Amino acid sequence: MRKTKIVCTIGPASESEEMIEKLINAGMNVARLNFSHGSHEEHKGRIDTIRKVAKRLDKIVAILLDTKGPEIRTHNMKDGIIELERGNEVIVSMNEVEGTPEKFSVTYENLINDVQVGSYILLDDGLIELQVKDIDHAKKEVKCDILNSGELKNKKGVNLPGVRVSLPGITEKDAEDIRFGIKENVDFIAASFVRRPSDVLEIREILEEQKANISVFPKIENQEGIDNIEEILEVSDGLMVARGDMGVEIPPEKVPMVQKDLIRQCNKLGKPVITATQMLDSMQRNPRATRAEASDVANAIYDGTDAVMLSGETAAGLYPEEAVKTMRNIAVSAEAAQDYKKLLSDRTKLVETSLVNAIGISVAHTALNLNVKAIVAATESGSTARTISKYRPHSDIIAVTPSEETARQCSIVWGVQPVVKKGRKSTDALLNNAVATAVETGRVTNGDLIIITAGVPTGETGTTNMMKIHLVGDEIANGQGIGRGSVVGTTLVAETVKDLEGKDLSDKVIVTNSIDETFVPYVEKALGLITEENGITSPSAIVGLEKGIPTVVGVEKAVKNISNNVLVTIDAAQGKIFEGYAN
Amino acid sequence: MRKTKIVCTIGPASESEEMIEKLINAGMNVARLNFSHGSHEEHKGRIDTIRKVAKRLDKIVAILLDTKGPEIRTHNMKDGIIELERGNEVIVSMNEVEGTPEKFSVTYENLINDVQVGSYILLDDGLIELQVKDIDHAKKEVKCDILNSGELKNKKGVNLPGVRVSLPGITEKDAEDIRFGIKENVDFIAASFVRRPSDVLEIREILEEQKANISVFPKIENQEGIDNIEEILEVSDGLMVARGDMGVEIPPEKVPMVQKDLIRQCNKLGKPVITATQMLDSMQRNPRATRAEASDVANAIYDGTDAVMLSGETAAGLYPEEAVKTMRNIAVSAEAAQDYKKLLSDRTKLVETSLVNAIGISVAHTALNLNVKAIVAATESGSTARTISKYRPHSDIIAVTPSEETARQCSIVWGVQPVVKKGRKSTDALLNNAVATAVETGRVTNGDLIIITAGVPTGETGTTNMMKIHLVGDEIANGQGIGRGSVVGTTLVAETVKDLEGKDLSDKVIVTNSIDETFVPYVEKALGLITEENGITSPSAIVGLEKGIPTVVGVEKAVKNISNNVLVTIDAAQGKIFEGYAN
Amino acid sequence: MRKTKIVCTIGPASESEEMIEKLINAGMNVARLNFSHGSHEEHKGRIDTIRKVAKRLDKIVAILLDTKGPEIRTHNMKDGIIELERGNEVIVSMNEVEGTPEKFSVTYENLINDVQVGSYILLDDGLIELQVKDIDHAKKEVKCDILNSGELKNKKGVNLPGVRVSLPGITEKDAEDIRFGIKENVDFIAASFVRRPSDVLEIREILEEQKANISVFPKIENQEGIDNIEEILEVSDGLMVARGDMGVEIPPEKVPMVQKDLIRQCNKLGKPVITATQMLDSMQRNPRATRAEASDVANAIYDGTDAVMLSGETAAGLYPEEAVKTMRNIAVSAEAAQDYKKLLSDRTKLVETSLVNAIGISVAHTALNLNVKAIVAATESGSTARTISKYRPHSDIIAVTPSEETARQCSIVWGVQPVVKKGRKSTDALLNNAVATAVETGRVTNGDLIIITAGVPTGETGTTNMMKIHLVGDEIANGQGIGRGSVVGTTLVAETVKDLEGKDLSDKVIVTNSIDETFVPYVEKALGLITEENGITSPSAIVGLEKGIPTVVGVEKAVKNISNNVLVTIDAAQGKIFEGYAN
Ligand SMILES: O=C1NC[C@@H](c2c[nH]c3cc(Br)ccc23)N[C@H]1c1c[nH]c2cc(Br)ccc12
Ligand SMILES: O=C1NC[C@@H](c2c[nH]c3cc(Br)ccc23)N[C@H]1c1c[nH]c2cc(Br)ccc12
């Protein structure tokens, strides 16, 4: 009962062995490392702090590396600062220059081939917005009308409202960053400013040289990216949705509409999605989030987000532990209050109806209708855990995996609580293990229903292809059942007809040797009946069937063996009796 | 295509005749007057500024009066300010006293009978929170443990986390405020701190003395209120949901969950709901809202809100017009992007299935499936406009009302654009007027489909009970139709077989006298056919039916009358031909 | 509660004025005249016997004329009879000859161009089946292998298992027969051996010369017909399904499968279908049908048949009245036992979702969910009665028509009980008349709900386009309702608190002047409350709302006016009270 995962950006305020512990405990599933800043030294240090604290507390926490990505900057400015009037003209040169309210240079020299007359250019994350008046490839200059006035520092950023920005997929830096990732077996890479499938593939070819197995999560920041969302997922292992980055190049009024649409588009293909940035940015300074932040976090989860990220709140903020705690809270809250029936019905239409998904569909329905405590998902890679996650069932998903690393990849998918048990070969071993693993988590006990799903045989496993429904043991008594119903109720072992005379409410299941004429008045008042020995037309049997009470005759030493007063559940079909609550 | 209504709190920054115009133009449906502050003088002044600007621009804008309501305050403090340590004790006296870090009085003398040992008390809108240690009715004092430290000014407020706060429904002030309302024929009263049905009824009995007809909108600020949400609506004409007020007495983490549930519960009964407070509170100082504000506004509209309110943003803020403009924008945006099929399907299950609703259901489906441009709703009171609004159809609802005032009451319900046309007696007049009214709005023209709904006969009108589907006129030609289909296509009047020889794509509807052997090669290549005179088995008719082309034979002077090249729509059944696009 | 219509073939056993009465009374909706046999003299005689008996008993009964149709016969045989061995050869000559076990002629001389080597030919309704060995157009002879042996009389029939039998649409006889129809304003023509649209059109061109307005019902007897079922209905007013005729050319094992599919294909377009032939053919000799006949009749009605026909059973059989009685019985039985929910749901998917149908859909659902007693359908032509019938609602359809003849056309459509009331011009007249007409049938009284549907304005009526839900009057008392519910219950006018003391069950609605402290104990025990005068927060009002009892305050002289002990129904919303049961 936790479901939506929490990604936390590690920083100064959270490097310590102490605070990493307190964050794992507050509910941190995935540690983010931002390579926009900081050296490989600093990062390698934190990776070790994380790995050790994690294996001490014995919890799966994954590592995510966020590439800095390609970008467009301003070359230094005269005096450092320089101003720009609100109705004037500025020249955007492709050759480096000192800054001036007239002449002014950018690090992306090819800008001039991407824009055109009338296109907008945004300086310093949208601080001041220009607009292209004319273009001379002669001088290689872009004359622009300054629309909103304001200042301009040196190495400040520039954004081109798509505009097929023609930067490469990855920096040379990025390429170095991501080789570092491969060296530390990091679990995720969050590729920045992705916009075409190429941009992802540039990272995947690097990974395939090393046969690295890392999941690759695009960061869709601009129109080109939004537009190519299907094609990008086609080639990607997940997805991030940074809204702060995205809000620059596209209007904030339009942003949530897109956020919804992206997350939807992930869920459709079962790719995990992270909603990122601007989540609880008040909690850097304060110890409790605003209402509109609490609202936005929740609406992420209502939009369908496998996970939720924290940037500065945990990195350099004043209150890291509190921001993690409060993140988990808002999650549990706005999940508590959501209708899994609609939710499932919704995904049943949304996701495609195909041989790959057949089981995800059956499992999710079966889980909802029979109220199963846990779906134990057996995975090598994790596809089965994600095939089950994507259909969003109330039941807690449990991913039993031999691969430690695929376990960490699971830590981000929705609803999946992963465990590492060692490889069984035979389907039979797979099934019995599952049932063991589910009980040893503690989330399931003897009463509960469990759905065991996996791809078998585990060798030729492509997709998940079988399910088993399983009661977690284990009939305390049994015999010949009469009737076909079932009930729960506290026992009342009766030696005599007078051993239940002036002390009888309903709501109990009576346990005698047989039924006389003197028992038949008392039986009808009761809930159930367990007679010791007998046959199908016996006095005990006939009186049960007739009065519509579920019973079981032919129970070995029922009076001696089964205890008095203990609550029990009988099942007419099967002819089994159980310890407490059953199904 | 506007749908979600905008309520704006008038204030200093927006009293002027000029700025009221600019706000009506930015999209203001309802002017709010907050009687928490300001004198009847100031309010009467603004009511006249509003009424005049509104009738000059010829737009319906309603007036809403927000009562101040009952409250709990602190009696003055020694030196004005007084401090309270974080682990100490403070005494909450029921008898007035000067303030002290020990002794300390409240205006609600009966507080002591509502609380109990362990209950929490919040000072100055939650600034510092106390907790009840012990109670002596002897001294009539409440000893409390101060949990969070902080200062305390004089006449500051106090909140008791429900706790059946036993204040009355309305102040004596409120009673005076609301009589003022009745004197100016104000359209709404937003009763503060409502929590039981009584509290509403207290206002309704006042109104019924005057036979005032004003809609009464509870403000649900505390648990007792939330808990009684059904019973309150039973007796209320609408509902507000102030979150700022609500966030005090209940945790912000839990707030949106409740917001959703309330709005739902309104939609279920078709009571309009206003989402209020903390909407775009950044726009008081700034000219454009944040992303998390833009997100929250939208998520209001996704939750299902008939309207959206602006407090300080339009009242005393720096940027009033911009905040109204941007409100409308975020509305249009997050409506644009929402699935009216799910929406309708959702409300079809959600609202009850009853004689009163039958027609709302039929109209909403009929509207979705046939893609009707406008649902014209004929109302005396407005119940029909709300019966249609509650099922949320894409179609623009138009409320034709004889009552000017019921028109202003409509201005708040979802999707309803009201107009005042004068009373027709006969159903026939009602129908023809409607069709006229719909066209004169300009939103519908000749191609369009229209659903006309009302309660008839208009006398014994209790609930809406009839609908008519109506094509907005008006067959330009007609005759004997052959086939049963229909198409749109540009004409090609052919005098000769050679009058369409070497100049023929498909996509056209040919208009000749009859069909020869020499026409029958060209007809099959075309979209439709209109022959001048003929019978059912004619050369013209038989060749159409056979080749599967919709045609009409027997058209009076078809070659002379119907123009060439003009786009036209023919209907095989009926045997009608139309000006442009039809249905 | 009758629904499925009964067509009866008039004959010797049923010509009499006496037996025609007894058949109309047994439930005969449509009199069939078979022009396969008998002279215009005999038929004109029966048409008058029918018209007179029908207008005497004041019941609508229609007249259906069944054309003999084109056919293939054998030219006379040598000695009259002639035999054919089981493994031998016979010659099918195109030139007339005397019969012989070798040479043998047929009236359809063109047979030879339709068949081919291997095709089967059936003699004497399938008595003996031949198969084409070789063809010589030289001698114009068809050499065939005789497969099943048997005798052969003279002018006996011949069938060619489709095989595009190339006969014309109609005999010259048929053409004369159908002109006779036009002269007697007969209501239906059942065209025999139809197989293409042409075959129907041949009858429709004849009709259009006379502007006759008669409905044309194909008889689909062979594969070509089955195959062209859609295209035939496109051009036809209804459809018959003679199984006896059909069983010849196609295997009996395959017949019901086709019957189902046809009837379905009618319902899809709302064309009425008659299931014909071999219905209760045991009842010609016996007085009560077999089980398998009773089964087949019902299964017709389950397949979705607008009507059911009787051939010999009523024509020349021994027991005509009994066969009609028993037909009606089996109908009522197997309708009684059928789920209108599935049925409607079924037709909602089956029939197309279009502007023409919108109202049929709404009306059918509205009718099912609100349990309306009668759908009164106002029609000039009858399309509205059929647009409603096709969606099969439990509610009894009533067709109010100015046209006497369109009333007789209605007598065959499913569920429609037609009446002739005189033309109203205004929608208002149309509505009020309807309500009158429904009550004057007697099927609806004051409690009942009614759906009034028609195409308006009645001038430009193409398709049905409006509905009104209407309670059949008429509030006996009214006033200010409190609460929103409603109940039924017997009154108990109380003058005193003691006027209901020691004589009080629940289940009653109390009628006093006002409520004291001494009434408030008794009110909570009751069902409803009607207090004489009062306001909304009155003692009477407040005690109702609080205890959840629907009440109405402000009822003029309620104690004096409304009677004691009479059963009554109150409605909290509206604030109306009614005579007995309401809605
Ligand atoms: O609710 C449903 N929706 C559609 C659907 C469905 C299930 N598996 C599928 C595989 C493919 Br491939 C396509 C469609 C389906 N099945 C029923 C349903 C499924 N499992 C259940 C268990 C219980 Br217990 C009760 C009801 C159901
Ligand atoms: O149950 C339904 N099934 C389908 C459907 C539907 C209704 N009108 C339509 C028009 C076109 Br065009 C296409 C589809 C529909 N509507 C609902 C429903 C309709 N009218 C109702 C009255 C009551 Br009272 C309760 C429920 C319903």
Full set of structural domains in chain B with CATH: 1-70+168-338 (3.20.20.60), 71-167 (2.40.33.10), 339-473 (3.40.1380.20), 474-583 (3.50.30.10)
Q: Taking the CB of residue B103, how many other CB atoms lie within 10 A of it?
A: 15
C362 CA → ligand 2 middle, Å: 5
Phi, psi (deg, nearest 5) at residue A565: 70, -25
Question: Could you give the CA distance from residue C248 to residue C196 in angstroms, rounded to a whole number?
Answer: 19
Three-state DSSP at A443 gives coil
Question: Is B330 in Cβ contact with A291 (below 8 Å)?
Answer: no
CB neighbours (10 Å) of residue B352? 8
Peptide bond into A474 cis (omega under 30): yes
Q: What are phi and psi of C81, to 5 degrees?
A: -100, 155
Is the shortest distance between the CB of C362 and ligand 2 below 6 Å?
A: yes
Counting one residue from chain A and one from chain B, the pairs whose CB atoms sit within 8 A come to 82
Pocket test for ligand 2, best of B351, B361, B370, B468 (most atoms within 8 A of CB): B361
Assess contact for C62 and C409: CB atoms under 8 A: yes
Residue A373: both structure tokens together: 């405590």
* CA–CA dist B48, B57 (Å, integer): 14
> Which among C293, C375, C300 is positioned nearest to C338, based on CA atoms?
C300
Q: In sequence order, what are the residues at sequence separation of 6 or more whose Cβ sits closer than 8 angstroms to the Cβ of residue B413?
A: B5, B272, B306, B382, B385, B386, B389
Look-up of token digits 């007609």: B478
Which residue intervals of B419-547 are DSSP H helices?
A: 427-441, 520-523, 539-547
Give the C-alpha separation, A500 to B568, whole Å: 89
After which residues does chain A show a gap where C to N exceeds 2.5 Å? none
Taking the C-alpha atoms of residue B3 and residue A567, their distance in angstroms, rounded to an integer, is 57
Does A36 appear as a known binding residue? yes
Query: For strand A273-276 and strand A239-242, is the pairing parallel, antiparallel, or unpaired?
Result: parallel
Alpha carbons A509 and A454: distance in angstroms, whole number: 39
- C-alpha to C-alpha distance for A385 and A376, rounded to whole angstroms: 9
C152 backbone φψ class: left, alpha, beta (φ>0; ψ -120 to 50)? beta
Three-state secondary structure call for residue C279? coil
Q: What are the distances in angstroms from CA C142 to CA C94, C154, C302?
A: 8, 19, 44
Q: Tokens standing for B389?
A: 């609004």
Secondary structure string (H, E, C) spanning A34-90:
ECCCCCHHHHHHHHHHHHHHHHHHCCCCEEEEECCCCCCEECCCCCCCEEECCCCEE
Residue B273 contacts residue B262 (beta carbons within 8 Å) = yes
Pick from B77, B90, B93, B96: nearest CA to B156 = B77
User: What is the side-by-side order of every strand in the sheet holding A551-553?
Assistant: A477-478, A576-578, A567-571, A486-493, A508-512, A528-531, A551-553, A480-482
Q: Which residues pair with C159 in a beta bridge?
A: C122
Question: What does the block give as tokens for A545?
Answer: 């069937």
DSSP structure string for B477-507 = EE-EEESS-EEEEEEEE-SSGGGGSSS--SS
Closest residue to A253, CB basis, from B243, B254, B329: B329
Q: How far apart are CA B364 and CA B342, in angstroms?
A: 12
DSSP code of residue C157 = B
| Among candidate residues B501, B474, B567, B574, the one with its CA nearest the CA of residue B528 | B567
Q: Is the Cβ–Cβ distance between A579 and A489 less than 8 Å?
A: no
Closest by Cβ to B468, choosing from C208, C365, C456: C456
Distance A302 CA to ligand 2 centre (A): 29
Cα B550 from Cα A236, distance rounded (Å): 50
Residue C28: closest CA among C414, C308, C419, C288: C308
In terms of Cα–Cα distance, which of A268, A260, A413 is closest to A346? A268
Alpha helices in B85-222 (DSSP H): 111-114, 172-183, 197-210
**CB distance A252–B289 less than 8 Å?**
yes
Contact B295 A255 (CB under 8 A): yes
CB A579 within 8 Å of CB A446:
yes
Question: What are the chain B neighbours of C574 within 8 Å (beta carbons)?
Answer: 462-463
Rg (chain C; Cα; Å): 31
Q: Could you tell me where the beta strands, DSSP code E, fall in B266-367? A: 273-276, 307-310
CA distance C261 to B383: 47
Q: Which of B96, B92, B100, B95 is nearest to B117 (CA)?
A: B92
| A10 sits in which H/E element | none
Which residues have CB under 8 Å from A321's CB, separation 6+? A19, A22, A23, A26
CA dihedral A77, A83, A86, A88 (to 10 degrees): -60
d(C-alpha C192, C-alpha C64), whole Å: 13
Instruction: Answer for the pair C380, C400: CB distance below 8 angstroms, yes or no.
Output: no
The torsion angles phi and psi of C143, rounded to 5 degrees, stand at -85, 130
Q: What span, in angstroms and rounded, lies between the C-alpha atoms of A416 and A376?
A: 9
> Cα separation of A288 and B107, whole Å?
30
Rounded to whole angstroms, how far apart are CA atoms A481 and A464? 36
**Which residues in chain A have their CB less than 8 angstroms from residue B299's CB?**
256, 295-296, 299
Q: Which bound ligand lies closest to the C-alpha atom of A362?
A: 1
Measuring CA to CA, which residue among C312, C173, C321, C166 is closest to residue C242? Answer: C312
Task: Give the residue, by CA position, lying nearest to ligand 2 atom 15.
Answer: B365
Beta carbon of C366 within 6 Å of any ligand 2 atom: yes
Separation of first and last alpha carbons in chain C: 21
Annotated binding site of B for ATP: 34-37, 73, 156
Q: Where are the alpha helices (DSSP H) in A146-304?
A: 172-183, 197-210, 223-227, 229-234, 243-249, 255-269, 291-303
Distance CA B512, CA B492 (A): 9
Query: Is residue B117 classed as helix, strand or coil in its secondary structure?
Result: coil
Q: Which amino acid is at B264?
A: R
CA distance C3 to C338: 12
Q: Which residues of C are catalytic?
A: 32, 73, 219, 277
Which residues of B are annotated binding-site positions? Answer: 32, 34-37, 66-67, 73, 156, 221, 244-245, 277
B463 and C369 within 8 Å at the Cβ level: the answer is no
% helix, strand, coil for chain A, step of 5: 35, 20, 45
The three-state secondary structure class of A456 is coil
Sheet holding A449-454, edge to edge: A416-419, A396-400, A374-378, A449-454, A466-471
Inter-chain touch A329–B253, beta carbons under 8 Å: yes
SS3 state of residue C82: strand
Which structure tokens are listed for C494? 């109380």
Measured CA to CA, the distance from residue C558 to residue C539 in angstroms comes to 17
Are B295 and A293 a contacting pair at CB < 8 A? Answer: no
Q: What does chain B come to in residues?
A: 583
CA–CA distance, A441 with A419 (Å, rounded to integer): 9
CB atoms within 10 A of CB A498: 10
- Count of pairs with CB atoms under 8 A, one residue in B, one in C: 107
Nearest by Cα to B265 from B304, B219, B217, B222: B304
Query: Vertex A305, ends A301 and A308: CA angle to 5°?
Result: 85
Q: Is A381 exposed, middle or buried (0-12, 13-18, 19+ CB in 10 A)?
A: middle
Cβ(B345) – ligand 2 distance below 6 Å: no
CB B453, CB B363: distance < 8 Å? yes
d(C-alpha B369, C-alpha B362), whole Å: 11
Stated as kind and residue range, the H or E segment containing A129 is: strand A128-136
Task: Find the C360 Cα to ligand 2 centroid distance in Å.
Answer: 10
Nearest-CA neighbor of B2 among B254, B328, B297? B328
Angle between helix C17-26 and C320-336 (nearest 10): 10
Residues 6+ apart with CB under 8 A from B571: B481, B486, B550, B577, B578, B582
d(CA B391, CA B303) in angstroms, rounded, equals 14
SS3 assignment for B143-182? EEEECCCEEECCCCEEECCCCCCCCCCCCHHHHHHHHHHH
Chain C residues with at least one Cβ partner in B under 8 Å: 197, 201, 204-205, 208, 234-235, 353-356, 358-359, 361-362, 365-366, 369-370, 426-428, 431, 449, 456-457, 462-463, 465-470, 483-484, 535-537, 542, 545, 573-574, 576, 583
A221 is in an annotated binding site: yes
- Solved using: X-ray
The DSSP code sequence of C217-233 is -----SHHHHHTHHHHH
Mark out the alpha helices in B194-290 (DSSP H runs).
Answer: 197-210, 223-227, 229-234, 243-249, 255-267
How close are the terminal C-alpha atoms of chain A, in Å?
Answer: 21
Residues contacting residue B26 through CB under 8 Å, at least 6 positions apart: B321, B324, B325, B327, B328
CA distance B149 to A30: 36
The distance from CA C544 to its chain's CA centroid, rounded to whole angstroms, is: 50
Q: What is the enclosing helix (H) or strand (E) of B104?
A: strand B103-105
Give yes or no for residue C344 CB within 6 A of ligand 2: no
Q: CA B455, CA B382: separation in Å to the nearest integer?
A: 11
- The enclosing H or E element of A509 equals strand A508-512
Q: Which residues contact C51 (CB under 8 A, 6 or more apart)?
A: none
Distance (Å) of CA C236 to CA C233, C272, C407: 5, 10, 19
Give, in degrees to the nearest 5, the angle at Cα B121 between B117 and B123: 155
Residue C433's nearest CA partner among C376, C395, C371 is: C376
State how far the Cα of C127 lies from the Cα of C150, in Å rounded to an integer: 7
Judged on CB neighbours under 10 Å (0-12, 13-18, 19+), C75 is: middle
Q: Is the peptide bond before B194 cis (omega within 30 degrees of 0)?
A: no
Is A540 among the annotated ligand-binding positions? no
Sheet holding C528-531, edge to edge: C477-478, C576-578, C567-571, C486-493, C508-512, C528-531, C551-553, C480-482
Residues C95 and A110: their CA atoms lie apart, in Å, by 93
Spatial CA neighbour of B272 closest among B206, B218, B205, B198: B218
From B389, B387, B384, select the one nearest B403 (Cα to Cα).
B384
Protein residues with CB under 6 Å of any ligand 1 atom = A 348, 353, 358, 361-362, 365-366, 369-370
The ligand with the least distance to the CA atom of B367 is 2
CA B160, CA B110: separation in Å to the nearest integer? 12
CA separation for the pair B361, B363 (Å, rounded)? 5
A73 is catalytic: yes
Distance from the alpha carbon of residue A446 to the mean position of ligand 1, in angstroms: 27
**Distance, in angstroms, between B296 CA and closest chain A CA?**
6
User: Which of C204, C358, C468 is nearest residue B466 as measured by Cβ atoms?
Assistant: C468
Rounded Cα gap, residues A288 and B500, in angstroms = 77
For residue A273, what are the β-bridge partners? A239
- C-beta separation of B63 from B30 below 8 A: yes
Amino acid sitting at position C294: A
The number of C-alpha atoms within 13 Å of C176 and in the hemisphere containing its C-beta is 8
Residues of B with catalytic annotation?
Answer: 32, 73, 219, 277
Ligand number nearest to the C-alpha of A465: 1
Decide: helix, strand or coil at residue B38. Answer: coil
Token digits of residue C384: 């509205």
Closest-approach residue (CA) in chain B for C576? B462
Query: Between helices C358-370 and B358-370, what is the axis angle to 10°?
Result: 150
Q: Angle at CA C80, nearest 5°, toward C79 and C81?
A: 95
Torsion of CA C164, C169, C173, C175, to 10 degrees: 180
Phi, psi of C492 (to 5 degrees): -150, 85
Query: What are chain A's partners, defined as 3 or more CB pairs within 8 angstroms?
Result: B
Collapsing DSSP to helix, strand or coil, B71 comes out as coil
DSSP strands (E only) in C45-88: 62-66, 82-84
- How many CB atoms are closer than 10 A to CB C242? 21
Asked if omega into C457 is within 30° of 0 (cis), the reply is: yes
Resolution in Å, one decimal, please: 3.3
B263: tokens are: 């709005």
Residues comprising chain C, all counted:
583
